[PDB]
Amino acid sequence: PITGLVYDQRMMLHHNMWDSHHPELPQRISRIFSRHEELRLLSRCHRIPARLATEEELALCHSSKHISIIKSSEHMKPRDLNRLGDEYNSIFISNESYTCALLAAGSCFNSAQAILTGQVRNAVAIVRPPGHHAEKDTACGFCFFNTAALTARYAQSITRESLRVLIVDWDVHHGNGTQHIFEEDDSVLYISLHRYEDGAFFPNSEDANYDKVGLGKGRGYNVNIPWNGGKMGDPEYMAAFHHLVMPIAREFAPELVLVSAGFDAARGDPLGGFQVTPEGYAHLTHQLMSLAAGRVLIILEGGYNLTSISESMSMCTSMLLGDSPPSTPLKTSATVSINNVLRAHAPFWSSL
Ligand SMILES: COc1ccc(-c2csc(C(=O)NOCCCCCC(=O)NO)n2)cc1
Ligand SMILES: [Zn+2]
Ligand SMILES: [Zn+2]
Ligand SMILES: [Zn+2]
Ligand SMILES: [Zn+2]
């Protein structure tokens, strides 16, 4: 099989003890997996085992202080879990949370190793909790450890430190944690598309504006594509890929592509309120397959409509497997955003 897939039910264990209906649901991953079964995709994929990230692997991106706190949650009584959760922006913690975050990251290391040692060409990682808001020193926005960031460092640690890794983050929210981790790094290109609303959208920071292009040797290696006003869908995202994502990615000529693949920009998503279709995410995946000789790992981030995320992610796996892609003027604010990013990134990317 040319595509690997990682899925472990143990990552369902993480749960919100006080709100069993919180939208970051255990069945996010089971619903995705079972849709893979329905669409006859599981039989085509090589099953990659999950495993725990080690603490030394976590230290690739996270402080020992942060690591320490999250690990301590394993032995906390309910009252302390509740207090600890409450110290961060939108986090719940149960006693299984730590183990699940380890699994999510280790699952992605195994997937990256599977791709880099030629076991598979590409892979999809059906994991939770998500990763991309987690910073070096703190959890945030349902995220404990930065799964995609760790995977990029892990990939470098088992090849060469200078391995060029692209992270495309198509979650509807900005990956503050990913940007910050790699903000002064030219070895990891970070590209994020995200609803912004001039700062009114989570995570509610100007860090996500198109003018944050990176720092030091990192200048040009942080691309933020912010949406302001309007339910963006397939047209805006395709246009963003044509004018920005792909021209820049091609020039960077990455050796591994990581997708921070939230499906919360999908039609039906209560959190995102956008309109990207499964076929849309299919075309995005197919386009990214033209980079790094096909060496793409798709990592689940957010996405809260169980039907939308299951149909979307399954469609991405279908494209990785090499199926044909399945079959509208832009909103104005989208043209505007694309044009602003083009201007901010012209200094760095001659493709633009
Ligand atoms: C009926 O319409 C609805 C509107 C909102 C919600 C809801 C549930 S919680 C939350 C929210 O926005 N919390 O703020 C934290 C965000 C972190 C995101 C995690 C991620 O996807 N990282 O990219 N919003 C539910 C229904
Ligand atoms: Zn990310
Ligand atoms: Zn994003
Ligand atoms: Zn960077
Ligand atoms: Zn999200």
Residues serving a catalytic function are 133
Experimental method: X-ray
Torsion of CA 147, 152, 158, 163, to 10 degrees: 180
Number of compact structural domains in the chain: 1
| Among the listed residues 161, 133, 136, 59, the one whose alpha carbon sits nearest the alpha carbon of residue 102 | 59
Give yes or no for residue 173 CB within 6 A of ligand 1.
yes
272 within 8 A of 237, measured Cβ to Cβ: no
Residue type, 148: A
Paired tokens of 127: 């994991």
Nearest by Cα to 280 from 338, 243, 252, 240:
240
CATH of the domain at 118: 3.40.800.20
What CA–CA distance (Å, rounded) separates 285 from 26? Answer: 25
**Token digits for 200?**
């009114």
Of 342, 289, 301, nearest in space to 32 by CA: 301
CB 7 within 8 A of CB 126: yes
144 is in an annotated binding site: no
**Was 8 annotated as part of a binding site?**
no
Kindly report the protein residue whose alpha carbon is nearest to atom 6 of ligand 1: 271
**N- to C-terminal Cα distance for the chain?**
37
Q: Alpha helix (H) ranges present in 14-161?
A: 27-38, 55-58, 64-72, 78-86, 97-116, 147-157
The CA-based angle 37-42-43, given to 5 degrees, is 115
Which value in Å is the resolution of this experimental model? 1.9
DSSP H/E element including 200: none
Count of beta carbons in the 10 Å neighbourhood of residue 32: 25
Residue partners of 170: CB distance under 8 A and separation at least 6: 193, 237, 259, 260, 261, 262, 265, 281, 284
Q: Token match 């692997």: residue?
A: 57
Antiparallel, parallel or unpaired: β 165-169 and 122-125:
unpaired
Contact 267, 96 (CB under 8 A): no
CA gap 42, 151 in Å, rounded: 23
Whose Cα sits closest to atom 23 in ligand 1? 173
Can you tell me the distance from the alpha carbon of 13 to that of 58, in angstroms, rounded to the nearest whole number?
20
DSSP notation for 289-339: TTSGGG-EEEEE-----HHHHHHHHHHHHHHHTTPPP---PPPHHHHHHHH
At 31, phi and psi to the nearest 5? -70, -40
Give SS3 for 226.
strand
Ligand positioned closest to the Cα atom of 182: 4
Q: Is the dihedral of CA 229, 233, 235, 239 positive or negative?
A: positive
Burial 90-121 (b: 16+ CB within 10 A, else e): ebbbbbbbbbbbbbbbbbbbbbbbbbbeeebb
- Mutate which of 16, 92, 271, 274 to test ligand 1's pocket (most atoms within 8 Å of Cβ)? 271
* DSSP code string of 236-281: HHHHHIIIIIHHHHHHH--SEEEEEE--TTBTT-TTT--BB-HHHH
Q: Which atom of ligand 1 is nearest to the CA of 89?
A: 15
Residues 150 and 181 sit within 8 Å (Cβ to Cβ): no
Q: Are 119 and 26 in contact (CB under 8 A)?
A: no
Task: Extract the tokens encoding 56.
Answer: 């030394």
Q: How far is the CA of 317 from the centre of ligand 4 (A)?
A: 26
Q: Hey, whose CA ends up nearest to atom 11 of ligand 1?
A: 271
Nearest C-alpha neighbor of 190 from the set 169, 209, 210: 169
The Å distance, Cα 142 to ligand 3 centre, comes to 15
Structure tokens at 235: 């047209």
- Residue bearing tokens 């059906």: 126
CB 50 within 8 A of CB 6: yes
Residue 28: CB within 6 Å of ligand 1?
Answer: no
Rounded to the nearest whole angstrom, what is the distance from the C-alpha of residue 170 to the centroid of ligand 1? 16
Check if 263 has its Cβ closer than 6 Å to any atom of ligand 1. Answer: no
Q: How far is the CA of 79 from the centre of ligand 2 (A)?
A: 31
Amino acid at the residue 274: F
Residue 111: which of 122, 101, 102, 127 has the closest Cα?
A: 122
Please indicate whether residue 23, judged by its CB atom, sits closer than 6 Å to ligand 1.
yes
193: annotated binding-site residue?
Answer: yes
Sign of the Cα pseudo-torsion (132, 221, 183, 197, in order): negative
Helix/strand/coil for 16: coil
Both tokens assigned to 105: 């990251």
Range of the domain at 25: 1-352
